[PDB]
Design a protein around this ligand. Sequence first.
Ligand SMILES: NC(=O)[C@H]1CCCN(C(=O)Cc2ccncc2Cl)C1
Ligand SMILES: [Zn+2]
Length: 139
Amino acid sequence: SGAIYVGNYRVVNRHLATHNDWANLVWEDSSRDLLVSSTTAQGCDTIARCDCQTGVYYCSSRRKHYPVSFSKPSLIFVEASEYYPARYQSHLMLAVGHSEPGDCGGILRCQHGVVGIVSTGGNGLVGFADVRDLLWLDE
Ligand SMILES: NC(=O)[C@H]1CCCN(C(=O)Cc2ccncc2Cl)C1
Ligand SMILES: [Zn+2]
């Protein structure tokens, strides 16, 4: 679990969105596993606007932050699950590191701010849904 709060927006994994998230829906994309809902309170997270390939992510299954090198956002095949059939997920970045299903929502950050959130994992690889291209989050 975990979300990004920027201005009047809440960014979450689409497979983990709540009834409230869907009732205050701004945008959602199944191919990216992302959903954005509106909020009454103001958010203070800073989104990075960069092409960084190094950062730090929070891993709840270990109660620890880990430094990682990660790939540029791309279409990567993701094995079937209870939330989606087998498909290519777009805007996905991979790193060598630990992750478990409950780790989704953990933030990945570089020196410029929030890069993305944990979205996939397995075989000693963790996947992050990139958010740096969503320029509208800041307006
Ligand atoms: N983005 C998706 O389609 C995910 C939906 C939930 C299931 N997905 C996983 O990868 C779950 C997983 C398994 C083992 N270790 C880490 C993780 Cl995050 C895929
Ligand atoms: Zn950066």
